[PDB]
Ligand binder design. Structure first.
Ligand SMILES: Cc1nc(C(=O)NCC(=O)O)c(O)c2ccc(Oc3ccccc3)cc12
Lengths: 242, 9
């Protein structure tokens, strides 16, 4: 079963080091975790003060996705209007992927920004609705997979280089980038010999879960255009989720 | 998209 070619190893190293350089709290996220107090976000009689809280919490997270994409030579070799479309498409998916790998079954929490443990209820009643369940259930299943930095990174790049996004000029350039990443990812999987059976199809199904998460936000934002003016949220949140 | 465009530069 084929393992990485030399060109794929160089590609694996580029994307891994871009991930590692932009992953919040690198590896000292394990003990920089402060748990959001149970007072913010439980069942209603959702609260607009927890929604605003999360809106400021997610803005560093978006910034780190942009930095991740700018560290890919392939991503930079693209017209600016394509970069914008690609980033808007994959931002939520990558952030949800970065939170879901930091799932802890003891506390049943994800950690945001390498620092903040939240529960399924806090995120749900803080604005995310069913998407909260989708990210946690994703977190619970990924525990089996033991994904390392390289695999997460490759996942991010595959999400990032989605050539099916509306408005893209160089659909074919994107698609041959994504297929480089896809081959590289599959061969690395082959080399790592995870004990889980049929790891690669099971992974392909998790990408779809991520794409589902990313695509539920033409729903969960009209969730919160109803009660407030636009000026209350940080500019960068509004630009990615509009 | 002004702020995204600035960041991507
Ligand atoms: C999905 C994800 N992720 C992250 C995140 O940082 N993940 C780890 C990382 O990127 O390193 C967040 O900080 C999030 C914050 C809020 C959020 O939902 C909401 C956003 C706005 C309003 C209500 C909920 C989802 C996040």
């Amino acid at each position: 079963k084929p393992e990485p070619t030399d060109e794929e190893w160089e590609l694996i190293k580029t994307v891994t080091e871009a991930h590692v350089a932009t992953n919040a709290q690198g590896s000292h996220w394990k003990q920089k975790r402060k748990f959001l107090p149970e007072d913010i976000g439980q069942a209603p009689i959702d609260d607009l003060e927890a929604f605003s809280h999360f809106t400021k919490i997610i803005t560093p997270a978006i910034t780190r996705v942009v930095d991740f994409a700018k560290k890919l030579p392939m991503f930079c070799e693209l017209p600016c209007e394509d970069q914008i479309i690609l980033l808007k498409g994959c931002c939520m998916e990558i952030m949800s992927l970065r939170a879901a790998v930091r799932y802890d079954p003891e506390s049943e929490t994800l950690t945001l920004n390498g620092e903040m443990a939240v529960t399924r209820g806090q995120l749900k009643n803080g604005g995310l609705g069913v998407v909260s369940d989708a990210i946690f259930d994703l977190g619970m299943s990924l525990s089996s997979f033991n994904l390392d930095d390289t695999e997460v990174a490759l996942l991010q790049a595959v999400l990032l280089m989605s050539s099916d996004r509306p408005g893209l000029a160089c659909v074919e350039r994107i698609e041959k980038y994504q297929d480089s990443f896809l081959l590289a990812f599959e061969h690395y999987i082959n080399y790592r010999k995870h004990h889980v059976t049929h790891f690669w199809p099971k992974l392909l199904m998790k990408v779809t879960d991520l794409r589902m998460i990313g695509a539920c936000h033409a729903s969960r934002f009209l969730h919160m255009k109803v009660e407030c003016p636009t000026e209350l949220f940080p500019p960068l949140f509004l630009e990615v989720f509009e | 998209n002004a702020l995204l465009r600035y960041l991507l530069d």
